[PDB]
RNA sequence: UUUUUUUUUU
């Protein structure tokens, strides 16, 4: 017990290309650094979690005065001992890819073999494949821009040629846009009153000053107050500068948003203040949802991410790029960032405006070659603020009888009964009762408003959601309407929240962060924080990936702050004491240095923007060089990247793909053995975090129902794919009808939706790319057939492949064995979860992502036959003693050595295959004779019982 | 609240 959780999180995966350093003398070799150096730095602990959920971060930062850097690792674990090896191995390997030590140069329980054996027309099948394949057997440039030019669409980047917009000139565009306005200016009472508003803006005492910087500067950077008016007013400012100045179509401004609900909303908003509709002057981009506006004078408010997929095309006829909210420090921020950088390095005329009312300018100005910083003072409406204390004191709640701690620190002008409540509460936990007394006292205070409050997740969310409906007071619907605000509840949901409730109905928010920054809610007035931000940590060395609830920063608190006191007067609720709120960081960390990177590689290749690691070392806070090389190594052993670190077709089409490559290398395979919609709608199931079974109270495990849906093949995406064909068939008959039939059968609608959308998604980008059409037609998959489907098989087999190397072999019960035999537990909620003495017809899985809990987990398990793992499961495949054949170095199976060495002779077979389909999508179901004979031959593998001749199992 | 689901992708 808990030793086995200490050898998993002590399991090292890549020590071979981080110059063999791995956690047994990681700590060592730091040790003997420091103590060479005098380096008098030691390790910072971060408790995470609650109580029972108690986990730890650990950050170390060495100076190397050699190369003038900070070396920094922050890593996770379940407890410090863990934590801080990792932490001590990250910085370690960034100190060998760093040429400041030396690579390692000294040095430091085997499975029941399972046998495999092939009929002799399957294996003279494979012969005669090898024989055809001839198969051996063993015995920098910047992003194009451009100033607005006639018969050109900005947005679609492409051009018009089309309607009567062939002789009209860009002067022309003009000089009407001006007639338009200024007749709107002149009639309209609706736009005056729009304009009478807007002057009242504390940035529109700003607006000469703004336009002037923005025309003398290439790169300016706004701060103002939450609600001021940057979003909904800069834009129209330099639109309305042009336009007046007779310039009219020579504007077109791109206004990037964290958050696809904050992007559609501001963009509502905008439109409905120049008294237009949506398309005309005003458009949005996000996922699953465009509407563009004119070719000429139009302002687009786009997310980061859509924007860079609009990169590949490039940026001819903007003139001005307004990014918002660099604070949040995203991944794909800090990316555009160092892509507008050299954007405007490049042309001199391009516009980049960076507002964010949270921002340390100094650092964003000396990352921008010193640039002008123009303040925005005063507030729309002042927001007042209290702290647990106050909370404390004013609701006179002291907790029930139930069982460095911030809430122990208190000013003496509150009273010791305060302070007693105080040391009584608990800092991790979130108290339902303090936050219902909270409520009771905002009801008392016979203020109306709407009630926003911020919680880390969907679990916190919902139990709270469930609390306050069974409360009398809270439950009644014709007094309150309680509403989540999660990224994953059904978009009308999520619109809902911005929708007026009825008189007499206050409106209470139950939000993540989408509700944090960027949106303005007319009616909220009180705003509680909890001040927890849910995290999700992954540790590189290990395959772990871990969901942390942290405590949030103080430019996370002023944002969820700044959602009241916009269209009236508000209040701040922190529910944290203020010990606790001055212990705050101010920024939280950036996600460039805890996520990998190879996606973001992939970019950098697509974009040409040259070496990653020079990209990458160009960013405002370069990223970890282990996690670049981590990342560029991945890209090499995938074949994205040709030997010369070059985008292959292959690397090309993945990173179209709004997927991993891993995920897009299996779908293309897919593609050529004609399941495409099947490893399309697999691969979106493995890149979503919503959930598809729903769990009612109390449920610990899958209902005999929702088990029932895998049928007799013990897969979680079969299970998923029969769930999404009758919601499919269900929807075709009306809304209501599915949300019956989801509701009744134990889905989750938004993440059918989505998965849905997914799949569309990747099958369009596949017919884009050249694939036929007859490679993705729909196939039913019947579950409840106990034996062989092929096509089925195919598809999960090619899920060992798109899942590598998440493969682990059940021993009893919930428990499994990960790579080199790593205790793990099968997750809650997998089909293949049960309390009894369960056996299944074999014992190896395919899962999709192994979670750090008080248990490793392995979750979305797929049951997968041992010729299915052997072909694409693994990478290793070598012959050990008494002829028994070992995969991954630890998985044993008794097949003969030579058919082994002839099956594994069909990995570079595949690999070939896929660089064919690479080469020409259109020809793939019309190949060479070999390699139509390989992928008849791969089928026959792949089929369920191809290595149970003469077994009994 | 007995951690299944921070955010993001023409
Ligand atoms: N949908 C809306 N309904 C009512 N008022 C709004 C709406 N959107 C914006 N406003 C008002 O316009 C002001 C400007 O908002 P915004 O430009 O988003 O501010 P910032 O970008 O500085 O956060 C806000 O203070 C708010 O009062
Ligand atoms: F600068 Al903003 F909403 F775009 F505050």
Redesign the pocket.
Known sequence: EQRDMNEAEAFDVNAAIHGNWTIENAKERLNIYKQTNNIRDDYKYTPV??E??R?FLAELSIYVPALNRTVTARESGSNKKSASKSCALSLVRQLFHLNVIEPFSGTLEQLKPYPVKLSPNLINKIDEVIKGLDLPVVNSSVIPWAPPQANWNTW??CNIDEGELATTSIDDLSMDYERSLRDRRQNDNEYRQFLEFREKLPIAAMRSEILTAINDNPVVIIRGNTGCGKTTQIAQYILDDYICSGQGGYANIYVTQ????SAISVAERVARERCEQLGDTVGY????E?VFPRPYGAILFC????LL??L??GLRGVSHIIVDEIHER?V?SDFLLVILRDMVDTYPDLHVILMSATIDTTKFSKYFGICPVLEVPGRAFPVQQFFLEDIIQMTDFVPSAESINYNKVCEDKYSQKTRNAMAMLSES?????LLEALLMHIKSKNIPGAILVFL?????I??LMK?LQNTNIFGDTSQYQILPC???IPRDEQRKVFEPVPEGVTKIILS???AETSITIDDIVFVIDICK????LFTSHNNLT??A?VWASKTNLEQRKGRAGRVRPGFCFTLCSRARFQALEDNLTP?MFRTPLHEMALTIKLLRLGSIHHFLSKALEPPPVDAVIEAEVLLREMRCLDANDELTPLGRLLARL?IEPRLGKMMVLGAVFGCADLMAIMASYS?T???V???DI?Q?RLANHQKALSGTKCSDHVAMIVASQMWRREKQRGEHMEARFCDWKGL?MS?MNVIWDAKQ?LLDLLQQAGFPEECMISHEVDERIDGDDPVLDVSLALLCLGLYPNICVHKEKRKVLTTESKAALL???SVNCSNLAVTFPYPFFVFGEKI???AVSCKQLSMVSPLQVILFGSRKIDLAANNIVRVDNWLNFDIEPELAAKIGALKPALEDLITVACDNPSDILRLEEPYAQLVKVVKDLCVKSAGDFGLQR
């Open positions: 979690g609650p029972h959920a986990s679609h980047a964290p958050r696809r609900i981009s996000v996922r699953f465009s997310t980061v991410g859509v997929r609009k590949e095309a995203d794909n936990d979130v108290s339902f009762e880390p997740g969907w679990n916190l919902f139990a609390f999660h990224s994953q993540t962060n989408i931000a849910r995290m999700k871990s969901y609830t996600e709004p890149s975090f919503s959930e079974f729903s769990l109390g610990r989750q993440t998604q997750h809650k909620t750090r809990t008080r």
